[PDB]
PDB file of C-alpha atoms in Angstrom:
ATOM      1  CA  UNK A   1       0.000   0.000   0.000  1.00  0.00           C
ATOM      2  CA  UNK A   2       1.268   3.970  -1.126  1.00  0.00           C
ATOM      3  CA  UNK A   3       2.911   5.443   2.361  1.00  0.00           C
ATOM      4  CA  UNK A   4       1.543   9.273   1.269  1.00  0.00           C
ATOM      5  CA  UNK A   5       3.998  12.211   1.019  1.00  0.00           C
ATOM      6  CA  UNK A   6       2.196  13.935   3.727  1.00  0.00           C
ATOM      7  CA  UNK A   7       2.328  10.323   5.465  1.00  0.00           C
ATOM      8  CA  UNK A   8       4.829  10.903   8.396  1.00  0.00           C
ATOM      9  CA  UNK A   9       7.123   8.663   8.807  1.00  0.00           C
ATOM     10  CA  UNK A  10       7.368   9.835  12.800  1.00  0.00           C
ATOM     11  CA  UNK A  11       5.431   6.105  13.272  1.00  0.00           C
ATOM     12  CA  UNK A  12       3.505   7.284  16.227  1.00  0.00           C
ATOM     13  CA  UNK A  13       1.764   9.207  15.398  1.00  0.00           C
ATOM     14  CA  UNK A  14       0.404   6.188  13.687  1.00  0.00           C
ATOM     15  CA  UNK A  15       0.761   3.896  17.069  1.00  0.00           C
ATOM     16  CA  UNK A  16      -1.566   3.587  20.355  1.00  0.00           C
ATOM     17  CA  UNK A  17      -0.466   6.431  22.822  1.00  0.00           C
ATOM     18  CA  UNK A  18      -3.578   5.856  24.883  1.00  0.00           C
ATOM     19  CA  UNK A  19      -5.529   2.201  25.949  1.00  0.00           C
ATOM     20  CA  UNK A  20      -8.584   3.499  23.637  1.00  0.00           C
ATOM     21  CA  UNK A  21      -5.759   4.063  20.837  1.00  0.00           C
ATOM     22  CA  UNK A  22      -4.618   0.571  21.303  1.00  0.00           C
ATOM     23  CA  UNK A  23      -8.149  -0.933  21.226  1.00  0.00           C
ATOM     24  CA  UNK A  24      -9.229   1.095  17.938  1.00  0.00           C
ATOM     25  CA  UNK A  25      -5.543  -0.652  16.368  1.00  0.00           C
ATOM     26  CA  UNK A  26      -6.902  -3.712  17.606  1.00  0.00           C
ATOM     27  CA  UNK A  27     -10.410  -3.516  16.290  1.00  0.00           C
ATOM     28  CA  UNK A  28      -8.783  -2.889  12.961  1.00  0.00           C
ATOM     29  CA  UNK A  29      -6.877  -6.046  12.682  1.00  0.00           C
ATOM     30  CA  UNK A  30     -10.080  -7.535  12.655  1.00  0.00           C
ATOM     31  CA  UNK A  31     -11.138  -6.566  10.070  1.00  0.00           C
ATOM     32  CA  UNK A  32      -9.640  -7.683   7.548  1.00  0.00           C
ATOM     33  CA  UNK A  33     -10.751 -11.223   9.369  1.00  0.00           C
ATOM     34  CA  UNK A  34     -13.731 -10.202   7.389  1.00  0.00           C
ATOM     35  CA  UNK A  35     -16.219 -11.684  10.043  1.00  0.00           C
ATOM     36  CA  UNK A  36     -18.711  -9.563  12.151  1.00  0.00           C
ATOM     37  CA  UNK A  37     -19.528 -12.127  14.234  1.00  0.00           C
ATOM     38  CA  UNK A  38     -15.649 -11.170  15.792  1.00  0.00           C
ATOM     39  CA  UNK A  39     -16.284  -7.815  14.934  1.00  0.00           C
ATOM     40  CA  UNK A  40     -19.215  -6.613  16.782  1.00  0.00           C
ATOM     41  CA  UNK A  41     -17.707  -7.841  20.339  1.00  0.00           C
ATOM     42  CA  UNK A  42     -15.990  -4.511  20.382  1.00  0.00           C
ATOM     43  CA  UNK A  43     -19.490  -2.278  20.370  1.00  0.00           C
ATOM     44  CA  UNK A  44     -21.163  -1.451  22.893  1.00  0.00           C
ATOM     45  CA  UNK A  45     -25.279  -2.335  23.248  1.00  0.00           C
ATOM     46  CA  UNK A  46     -25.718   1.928  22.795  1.00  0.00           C
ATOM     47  CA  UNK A  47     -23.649   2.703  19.939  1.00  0.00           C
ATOM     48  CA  UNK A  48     -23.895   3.375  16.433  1.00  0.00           C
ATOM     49  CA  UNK A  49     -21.823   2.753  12.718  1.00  0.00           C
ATOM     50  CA  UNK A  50     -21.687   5.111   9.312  1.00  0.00           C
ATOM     51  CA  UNK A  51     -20.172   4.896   6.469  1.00  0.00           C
ATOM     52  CA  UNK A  52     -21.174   8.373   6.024  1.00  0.00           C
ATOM     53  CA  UNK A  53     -22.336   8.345   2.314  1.00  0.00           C
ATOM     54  CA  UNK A  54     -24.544   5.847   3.459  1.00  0.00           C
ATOM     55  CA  UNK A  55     -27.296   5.556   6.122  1.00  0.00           C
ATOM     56  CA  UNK A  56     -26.349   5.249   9.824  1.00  0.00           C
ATOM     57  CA  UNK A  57     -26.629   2.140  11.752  1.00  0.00           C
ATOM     58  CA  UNK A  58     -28.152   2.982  15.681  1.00  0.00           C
ATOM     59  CA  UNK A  59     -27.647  -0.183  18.132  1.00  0.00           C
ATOM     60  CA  UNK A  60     -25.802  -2.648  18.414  1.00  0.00           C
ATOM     61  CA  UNK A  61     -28.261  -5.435  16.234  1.00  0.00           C
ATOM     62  CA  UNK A  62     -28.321  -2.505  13.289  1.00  0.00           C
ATOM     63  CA  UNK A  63     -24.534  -2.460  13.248  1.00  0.00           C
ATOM     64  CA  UNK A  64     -24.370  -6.314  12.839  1.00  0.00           C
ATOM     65  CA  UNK A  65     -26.765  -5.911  10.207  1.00  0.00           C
ATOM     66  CA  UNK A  66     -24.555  -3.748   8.368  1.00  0.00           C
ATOM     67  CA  UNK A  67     -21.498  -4.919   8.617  1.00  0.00           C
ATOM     68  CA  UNK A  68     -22.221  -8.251   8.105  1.00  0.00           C
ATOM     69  CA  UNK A  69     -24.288  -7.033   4.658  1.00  0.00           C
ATOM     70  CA  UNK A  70     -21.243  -5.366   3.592  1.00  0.00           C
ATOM     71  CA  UNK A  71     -18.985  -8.909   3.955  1.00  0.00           C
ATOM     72  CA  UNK A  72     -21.228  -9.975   1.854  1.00  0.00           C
ATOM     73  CA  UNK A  73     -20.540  -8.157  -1.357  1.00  0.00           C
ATOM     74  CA  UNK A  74     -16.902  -6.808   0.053  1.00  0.00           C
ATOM     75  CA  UNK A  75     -13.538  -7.883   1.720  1.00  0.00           C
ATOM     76  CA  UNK A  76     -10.659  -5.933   3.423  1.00  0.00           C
ATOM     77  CA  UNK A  77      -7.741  -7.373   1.937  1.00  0.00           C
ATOM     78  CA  UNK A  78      -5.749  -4.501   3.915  1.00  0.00           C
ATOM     79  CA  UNK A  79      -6.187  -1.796   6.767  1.00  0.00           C
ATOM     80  CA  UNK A  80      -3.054   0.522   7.207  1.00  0.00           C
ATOM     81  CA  UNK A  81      -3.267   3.492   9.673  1.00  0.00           C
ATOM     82  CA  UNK A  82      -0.790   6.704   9.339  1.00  0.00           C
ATOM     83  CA  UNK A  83      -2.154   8.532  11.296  1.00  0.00           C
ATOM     84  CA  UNK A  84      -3.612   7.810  15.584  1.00  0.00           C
ATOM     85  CA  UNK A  85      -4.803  10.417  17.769  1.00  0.00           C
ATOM     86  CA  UNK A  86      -7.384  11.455  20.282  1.00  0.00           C
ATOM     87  CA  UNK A  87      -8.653  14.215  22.734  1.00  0.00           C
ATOM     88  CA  UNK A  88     -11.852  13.485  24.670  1.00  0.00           C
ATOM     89  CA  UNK A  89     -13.355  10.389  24.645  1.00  0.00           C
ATOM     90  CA  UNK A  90     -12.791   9.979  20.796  1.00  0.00           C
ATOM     91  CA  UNK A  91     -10.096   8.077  18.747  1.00  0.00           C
ATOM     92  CA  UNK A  92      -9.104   9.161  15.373  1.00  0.00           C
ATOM     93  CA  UNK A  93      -7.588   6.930  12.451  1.00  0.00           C
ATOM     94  CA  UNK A  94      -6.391   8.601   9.263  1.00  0.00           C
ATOM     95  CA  UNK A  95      -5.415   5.347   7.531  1.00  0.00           C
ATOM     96  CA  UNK A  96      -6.168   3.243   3.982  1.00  0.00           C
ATOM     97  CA  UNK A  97      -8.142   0.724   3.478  1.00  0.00           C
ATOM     98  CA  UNK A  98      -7.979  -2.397   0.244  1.00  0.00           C
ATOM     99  CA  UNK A  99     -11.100  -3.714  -0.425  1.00  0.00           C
ATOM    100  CA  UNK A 100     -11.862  -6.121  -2.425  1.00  0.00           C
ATOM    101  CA  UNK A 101     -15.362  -5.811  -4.310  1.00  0.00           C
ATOM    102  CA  UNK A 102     -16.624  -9.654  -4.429  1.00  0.00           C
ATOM    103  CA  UNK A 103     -18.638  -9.594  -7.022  1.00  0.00           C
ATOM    104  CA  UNK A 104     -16.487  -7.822  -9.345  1.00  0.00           C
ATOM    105  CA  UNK A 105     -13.528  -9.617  -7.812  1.00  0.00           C
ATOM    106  CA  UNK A 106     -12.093  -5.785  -8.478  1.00  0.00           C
ATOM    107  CA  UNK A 107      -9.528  -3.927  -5.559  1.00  0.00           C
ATOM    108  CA  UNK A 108      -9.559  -0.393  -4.581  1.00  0.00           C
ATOM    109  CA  UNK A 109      -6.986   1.843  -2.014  1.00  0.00           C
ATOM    110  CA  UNK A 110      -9.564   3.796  -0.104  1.00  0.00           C
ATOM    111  CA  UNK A 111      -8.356   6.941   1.478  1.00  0.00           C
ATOM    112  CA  UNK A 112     -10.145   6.797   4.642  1.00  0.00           C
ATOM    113  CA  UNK A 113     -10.674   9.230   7.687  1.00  0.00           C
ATOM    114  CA  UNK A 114     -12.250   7.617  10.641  1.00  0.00           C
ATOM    115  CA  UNK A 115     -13.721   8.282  14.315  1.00  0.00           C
ATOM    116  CA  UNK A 116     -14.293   6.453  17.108  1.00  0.00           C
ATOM    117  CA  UNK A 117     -16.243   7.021  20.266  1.00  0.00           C
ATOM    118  CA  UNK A 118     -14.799   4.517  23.148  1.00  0.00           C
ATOM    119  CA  UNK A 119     -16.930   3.901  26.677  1.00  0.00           C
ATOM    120  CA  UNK A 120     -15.815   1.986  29.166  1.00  0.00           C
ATOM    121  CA  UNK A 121     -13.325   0.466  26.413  1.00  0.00           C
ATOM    122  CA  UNK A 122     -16.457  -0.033  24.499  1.00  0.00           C
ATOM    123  CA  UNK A 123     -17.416   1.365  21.168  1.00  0.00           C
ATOM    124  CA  UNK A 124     -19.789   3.605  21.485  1.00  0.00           C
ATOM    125  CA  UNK A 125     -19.228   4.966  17.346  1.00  0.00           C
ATOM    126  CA  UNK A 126     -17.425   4.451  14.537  1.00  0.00           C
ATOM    127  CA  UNK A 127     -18.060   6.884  11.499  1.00  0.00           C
ATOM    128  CA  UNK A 128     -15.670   6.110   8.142  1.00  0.00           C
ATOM    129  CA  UNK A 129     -15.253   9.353   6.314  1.00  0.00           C
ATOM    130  CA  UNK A 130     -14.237   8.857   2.137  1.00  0.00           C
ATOM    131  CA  UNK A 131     -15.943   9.727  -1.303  1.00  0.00           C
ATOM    132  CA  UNK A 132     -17.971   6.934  -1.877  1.00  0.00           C
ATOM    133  CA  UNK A 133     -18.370   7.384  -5.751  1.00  0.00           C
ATOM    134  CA  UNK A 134     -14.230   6.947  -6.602  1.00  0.00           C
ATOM    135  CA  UNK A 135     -15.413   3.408  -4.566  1.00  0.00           C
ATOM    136  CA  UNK A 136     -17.637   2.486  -6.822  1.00  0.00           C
ATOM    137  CA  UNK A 137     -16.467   3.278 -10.576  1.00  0.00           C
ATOM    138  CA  UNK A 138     -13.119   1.722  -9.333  1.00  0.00           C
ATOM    139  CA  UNK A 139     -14.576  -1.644  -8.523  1.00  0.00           C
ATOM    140  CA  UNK A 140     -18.235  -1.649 -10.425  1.00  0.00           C
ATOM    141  CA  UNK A 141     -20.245  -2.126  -7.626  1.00  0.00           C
ATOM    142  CA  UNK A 142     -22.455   0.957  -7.411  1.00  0.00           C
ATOM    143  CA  UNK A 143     -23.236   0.251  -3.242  1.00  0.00           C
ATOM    144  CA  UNK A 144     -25.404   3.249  -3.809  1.00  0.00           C
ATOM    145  CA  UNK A 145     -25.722   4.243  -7.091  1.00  0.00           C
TER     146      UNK A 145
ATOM    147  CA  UNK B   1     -28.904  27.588   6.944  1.00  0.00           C
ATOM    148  CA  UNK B   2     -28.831  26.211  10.275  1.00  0.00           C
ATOM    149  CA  UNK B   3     -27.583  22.888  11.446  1.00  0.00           C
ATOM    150  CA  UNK B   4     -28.978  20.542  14.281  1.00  0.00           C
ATOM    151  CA  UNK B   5     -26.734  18.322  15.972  1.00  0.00           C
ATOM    152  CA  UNK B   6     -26.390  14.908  15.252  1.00  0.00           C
ATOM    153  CA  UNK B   7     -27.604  12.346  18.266  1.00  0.00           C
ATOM    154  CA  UNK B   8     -24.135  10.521  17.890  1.00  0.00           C
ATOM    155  CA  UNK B   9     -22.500  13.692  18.379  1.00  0.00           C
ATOM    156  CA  UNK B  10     -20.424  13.041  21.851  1.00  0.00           C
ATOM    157  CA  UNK B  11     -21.852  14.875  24.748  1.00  0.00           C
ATOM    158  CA  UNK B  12     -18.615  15.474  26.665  1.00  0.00           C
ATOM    159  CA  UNK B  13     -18.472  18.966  26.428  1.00  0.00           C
ATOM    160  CA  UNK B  14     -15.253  19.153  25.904  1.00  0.00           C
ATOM    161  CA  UNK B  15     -15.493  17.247  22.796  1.00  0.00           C
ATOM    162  CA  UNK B  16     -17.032  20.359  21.340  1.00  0.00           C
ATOM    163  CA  UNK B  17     -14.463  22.758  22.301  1.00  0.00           C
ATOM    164  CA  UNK B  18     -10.597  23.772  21.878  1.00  0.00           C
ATOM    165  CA  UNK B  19      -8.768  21.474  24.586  1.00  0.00           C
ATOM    166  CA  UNK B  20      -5.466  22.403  23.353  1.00  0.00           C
ATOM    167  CA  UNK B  21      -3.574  25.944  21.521  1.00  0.00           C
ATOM    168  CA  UNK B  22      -3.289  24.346  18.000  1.00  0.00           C
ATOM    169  CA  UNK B  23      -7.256  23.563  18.246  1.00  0.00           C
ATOM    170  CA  UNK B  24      -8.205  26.798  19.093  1.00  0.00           C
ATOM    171  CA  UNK B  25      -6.036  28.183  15.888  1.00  0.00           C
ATOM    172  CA  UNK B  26      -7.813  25.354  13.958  1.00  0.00           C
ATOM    173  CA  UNK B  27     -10.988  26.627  15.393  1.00  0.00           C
ATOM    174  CA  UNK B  28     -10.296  29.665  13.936  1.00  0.00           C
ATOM    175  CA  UNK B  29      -9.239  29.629  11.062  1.00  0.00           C
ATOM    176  CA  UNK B  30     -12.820  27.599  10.574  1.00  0.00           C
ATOM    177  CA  UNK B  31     -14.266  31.107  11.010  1.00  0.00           C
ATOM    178  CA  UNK B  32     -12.291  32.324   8.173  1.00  0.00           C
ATOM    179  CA  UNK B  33     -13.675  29.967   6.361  1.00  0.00           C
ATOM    180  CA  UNK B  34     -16.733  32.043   5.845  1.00  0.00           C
ATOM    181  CA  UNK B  35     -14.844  34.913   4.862  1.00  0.00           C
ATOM    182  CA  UNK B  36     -14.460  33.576   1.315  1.00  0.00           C
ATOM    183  CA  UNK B  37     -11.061  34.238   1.134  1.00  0.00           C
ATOM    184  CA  UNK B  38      -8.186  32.686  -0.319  1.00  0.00           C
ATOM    185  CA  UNK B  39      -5.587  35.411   0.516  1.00  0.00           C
ATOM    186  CA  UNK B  40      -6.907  35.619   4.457  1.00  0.00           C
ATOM    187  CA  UNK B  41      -6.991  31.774   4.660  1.00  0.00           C
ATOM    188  CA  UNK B  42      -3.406  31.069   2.986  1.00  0.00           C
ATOM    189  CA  UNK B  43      -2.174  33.079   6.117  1.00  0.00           C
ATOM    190  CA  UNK B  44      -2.649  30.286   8.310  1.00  0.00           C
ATOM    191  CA  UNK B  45      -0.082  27.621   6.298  1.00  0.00           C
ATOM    192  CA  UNK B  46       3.389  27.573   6.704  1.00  0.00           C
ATOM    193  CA  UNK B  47       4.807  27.489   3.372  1.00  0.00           C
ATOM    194  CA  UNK B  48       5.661  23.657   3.201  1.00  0.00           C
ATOM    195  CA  UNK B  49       2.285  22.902   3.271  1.00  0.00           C
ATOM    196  CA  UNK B  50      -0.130  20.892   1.413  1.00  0.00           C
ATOM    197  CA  UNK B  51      -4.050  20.766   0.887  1.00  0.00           C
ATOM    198  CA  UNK B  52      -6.384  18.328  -0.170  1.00  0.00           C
ATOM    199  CA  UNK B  53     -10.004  17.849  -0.417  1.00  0.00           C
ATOM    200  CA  UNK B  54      -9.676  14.415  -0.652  1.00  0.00           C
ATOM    201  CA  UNK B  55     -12.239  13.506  -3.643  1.00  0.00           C
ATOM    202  CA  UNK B  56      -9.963  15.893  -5.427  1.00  0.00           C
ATOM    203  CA  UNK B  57      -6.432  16.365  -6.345  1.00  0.00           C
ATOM    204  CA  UNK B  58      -3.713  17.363  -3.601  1.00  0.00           C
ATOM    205  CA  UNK B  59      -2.198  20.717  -3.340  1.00  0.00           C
ATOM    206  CA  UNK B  60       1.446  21.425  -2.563  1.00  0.00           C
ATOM    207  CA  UNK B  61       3.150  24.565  -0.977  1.00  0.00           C
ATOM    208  CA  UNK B  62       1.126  27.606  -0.232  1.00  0.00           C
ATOM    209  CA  UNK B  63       1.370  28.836  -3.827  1.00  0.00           C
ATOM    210  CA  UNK B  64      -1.009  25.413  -5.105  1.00  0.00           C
ATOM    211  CA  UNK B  65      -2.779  25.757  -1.687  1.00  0.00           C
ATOM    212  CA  UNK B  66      -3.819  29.546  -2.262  1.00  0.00           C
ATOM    213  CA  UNK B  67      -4.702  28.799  -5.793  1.00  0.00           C
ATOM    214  CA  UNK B  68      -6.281  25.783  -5.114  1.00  0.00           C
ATOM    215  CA  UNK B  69      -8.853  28.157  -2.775  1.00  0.00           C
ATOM    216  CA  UNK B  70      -9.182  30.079  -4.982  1.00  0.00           C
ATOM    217  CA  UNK B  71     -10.475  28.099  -7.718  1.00  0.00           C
ATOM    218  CA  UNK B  72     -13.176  26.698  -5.336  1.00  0.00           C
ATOM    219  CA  UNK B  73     -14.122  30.292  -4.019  1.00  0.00           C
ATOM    220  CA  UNK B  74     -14.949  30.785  -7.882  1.00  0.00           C
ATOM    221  CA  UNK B  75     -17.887  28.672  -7.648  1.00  0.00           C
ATOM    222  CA  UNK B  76     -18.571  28.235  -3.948  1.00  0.00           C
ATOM    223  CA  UNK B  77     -19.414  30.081  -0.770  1.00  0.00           C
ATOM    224  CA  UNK B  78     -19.144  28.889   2.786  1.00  0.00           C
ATOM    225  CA  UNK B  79     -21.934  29.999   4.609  1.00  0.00           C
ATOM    226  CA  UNK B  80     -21.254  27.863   7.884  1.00  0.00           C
ATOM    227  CA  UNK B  81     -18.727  25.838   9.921  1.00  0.00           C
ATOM    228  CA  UNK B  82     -20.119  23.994  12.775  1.00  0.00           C
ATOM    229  CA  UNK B  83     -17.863  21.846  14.675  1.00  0.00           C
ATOM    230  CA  UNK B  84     -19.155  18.517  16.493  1.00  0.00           C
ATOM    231  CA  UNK B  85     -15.920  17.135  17.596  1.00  0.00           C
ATOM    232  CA  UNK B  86     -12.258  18.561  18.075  1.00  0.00           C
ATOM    233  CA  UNK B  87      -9.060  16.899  19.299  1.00  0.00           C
ATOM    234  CA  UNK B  88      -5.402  16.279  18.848  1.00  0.00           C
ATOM    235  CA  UNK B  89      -2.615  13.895  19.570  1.00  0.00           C
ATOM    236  CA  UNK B  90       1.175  13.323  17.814  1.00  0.00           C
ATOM    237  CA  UNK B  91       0.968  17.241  16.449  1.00  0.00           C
ATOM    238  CA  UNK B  92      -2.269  16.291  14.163  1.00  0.00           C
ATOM    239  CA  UNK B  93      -5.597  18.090  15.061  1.00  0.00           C
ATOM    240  CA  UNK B  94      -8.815  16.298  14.127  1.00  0.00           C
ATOM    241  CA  UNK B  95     -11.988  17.795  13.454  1.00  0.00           C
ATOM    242  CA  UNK B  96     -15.864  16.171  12.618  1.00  0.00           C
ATOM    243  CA  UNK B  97     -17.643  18.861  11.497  1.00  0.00           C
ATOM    244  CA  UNK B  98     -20.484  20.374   8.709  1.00  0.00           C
ATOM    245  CA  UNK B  99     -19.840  22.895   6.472  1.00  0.00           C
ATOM    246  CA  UNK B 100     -22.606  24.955   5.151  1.00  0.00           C
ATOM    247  CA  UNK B 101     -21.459  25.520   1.497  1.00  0.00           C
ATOM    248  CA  UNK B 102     -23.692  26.897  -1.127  1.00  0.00           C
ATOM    249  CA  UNK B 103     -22.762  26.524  -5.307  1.00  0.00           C
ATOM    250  CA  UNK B 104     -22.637  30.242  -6.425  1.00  0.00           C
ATOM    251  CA  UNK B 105     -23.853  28.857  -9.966  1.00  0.00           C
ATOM    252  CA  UNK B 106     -26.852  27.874  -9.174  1.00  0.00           C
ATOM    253  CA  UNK B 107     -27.775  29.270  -5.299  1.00  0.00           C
ATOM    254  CA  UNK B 108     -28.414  25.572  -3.862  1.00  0.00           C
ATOM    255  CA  UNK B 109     -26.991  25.098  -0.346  1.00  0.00           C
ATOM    256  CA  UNK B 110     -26.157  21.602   0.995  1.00  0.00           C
ATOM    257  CA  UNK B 111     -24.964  20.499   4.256  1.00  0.00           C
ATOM    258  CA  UNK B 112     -21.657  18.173   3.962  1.00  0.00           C
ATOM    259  CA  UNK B 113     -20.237  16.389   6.520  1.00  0.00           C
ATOM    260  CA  UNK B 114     -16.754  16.484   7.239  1.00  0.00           C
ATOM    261  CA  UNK B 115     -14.010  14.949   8.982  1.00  0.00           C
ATOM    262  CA  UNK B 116     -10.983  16.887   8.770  1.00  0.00           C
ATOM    263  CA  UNK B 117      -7.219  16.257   9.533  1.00  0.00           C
ATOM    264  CA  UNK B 118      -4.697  19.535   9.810  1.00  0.00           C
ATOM    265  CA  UNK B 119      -1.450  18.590  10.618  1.00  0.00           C
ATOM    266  CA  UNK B 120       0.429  21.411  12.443  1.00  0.00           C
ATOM    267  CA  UNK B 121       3.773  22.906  13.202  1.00  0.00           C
ATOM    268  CA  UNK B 122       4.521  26.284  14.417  1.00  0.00           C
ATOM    269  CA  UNK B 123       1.095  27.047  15.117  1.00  0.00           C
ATOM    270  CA  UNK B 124       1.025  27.605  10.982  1.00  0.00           C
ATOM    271  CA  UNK B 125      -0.529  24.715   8.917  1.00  0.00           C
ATOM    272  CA  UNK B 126       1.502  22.649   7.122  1.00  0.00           C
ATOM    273  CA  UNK B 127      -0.982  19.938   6.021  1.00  0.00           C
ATOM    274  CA  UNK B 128      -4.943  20.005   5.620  1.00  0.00           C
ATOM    275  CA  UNK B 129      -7.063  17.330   4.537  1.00  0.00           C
ATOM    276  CA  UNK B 130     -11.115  16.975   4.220  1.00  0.00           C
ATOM    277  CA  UNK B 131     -12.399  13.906   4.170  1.00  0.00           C
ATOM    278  CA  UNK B 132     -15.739  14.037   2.688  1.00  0.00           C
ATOM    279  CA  UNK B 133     -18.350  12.302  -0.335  1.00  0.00           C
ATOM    280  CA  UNK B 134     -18.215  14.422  -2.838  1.00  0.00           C
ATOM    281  CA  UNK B 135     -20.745  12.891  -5.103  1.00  0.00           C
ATOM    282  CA  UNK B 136     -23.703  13.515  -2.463  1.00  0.00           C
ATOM    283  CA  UNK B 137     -22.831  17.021  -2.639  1.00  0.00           C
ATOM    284  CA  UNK B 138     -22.557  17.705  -6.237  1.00  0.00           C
ATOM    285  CA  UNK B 139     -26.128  16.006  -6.885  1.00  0.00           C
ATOM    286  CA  UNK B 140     -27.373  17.688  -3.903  1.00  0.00           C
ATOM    287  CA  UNK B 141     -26.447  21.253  -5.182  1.00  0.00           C
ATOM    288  CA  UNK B 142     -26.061  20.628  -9.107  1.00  0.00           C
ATOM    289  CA  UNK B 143     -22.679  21.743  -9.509  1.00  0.00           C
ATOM    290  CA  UNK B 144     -20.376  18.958 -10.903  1.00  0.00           C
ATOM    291  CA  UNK B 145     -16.762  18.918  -9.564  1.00  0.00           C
ATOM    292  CA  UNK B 146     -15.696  15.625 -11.135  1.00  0.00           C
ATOM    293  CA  UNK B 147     -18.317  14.498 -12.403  1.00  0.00           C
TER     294      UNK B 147
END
């Protein structure tokens, strides 16, 4: 995967400075297990998921919905952070992540900018910030349309 | 014009404000914004700096970055920057916010939600990049800016 030039290459920031830090790296390592039966032991009952171009999952049954939905039609092949910080309550991961479009069998480099809300070492939200559209014409699988 | 907060939005109230120096110059510069600028806003960046709305091409040194606003400022108009969350760690400063931009072509305003990194040095900016979908706005407002 492309190490950006604005990328630095200080590597932390880009590791855990904080538990919550370490627990976000963790939860990311997962996924590219690709399973959200493993997944969804990190969220809280109260919580939430977006991927923000598309509609918000509330509770902790509507994020297994969702991210289970998405396994079905997608894989990460690769998650890689740059980038690991957070101030109050809320982790931040500006990172890149390889999917894999299964029906297409077509792979994409996703510039990614994501937030996490951690409770009790629980995730409370996780909202994935990217242009949805350079997804979709990359890998022909119009997830919206 | 005006925006309601989210009910994810974190409700530690510090979440929502400055909680170090280089957010509060973030902060501010968020203001200026709305001033429509691009000769008021390139003040804040160091001059090895860089810029990128990221559904769009980066910009390098001030001279791109300056440009670069000014190209959008040709067809665009903040009219609002409200910031959810704020933080910082490692010299980076984070923001989740939602811009209030309207197309100047055709007078249609859209909300569009942003998460924003600005990496910073010297209290000058020396990296900024929006993370956004850029589609949802385009559609939303009729102005095509890739198409």
């Amino acid at each position: 995967i492309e190490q950006p030039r604005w990328a630095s290459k200080d590597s932390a920031a880009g590791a855990a400075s904080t538990p919550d830090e370490k627990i976000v790296l963790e939860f990311m390592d997962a996924l590219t297990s690709n399973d959200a039966a493993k997944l969804i032991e990190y969220f809280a009952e109260d919580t939430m998921y977006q991927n923000m171009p598309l509609p918000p999952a509330y509770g902790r049954d509507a994020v297994e919905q969702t991210l289970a939905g998405l396994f079905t039609v997608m894989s990460y092949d690769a998650v890689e952070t740059f980038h690991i910080g957070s101030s109050n309550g809320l982790v931040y991961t500006e990172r890149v992540d390889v999917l894999r479009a299964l029906p297409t069998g077509k792979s994409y480099n996703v510039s990614v900018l994501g937030v996490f809300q951690l409770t009790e070492g629980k995730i409370t939200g996780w909202r994935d910030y990217f242009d949805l559209r350079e997804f979709e014409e990359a890998v022909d699988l119009p997830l919206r349309g």
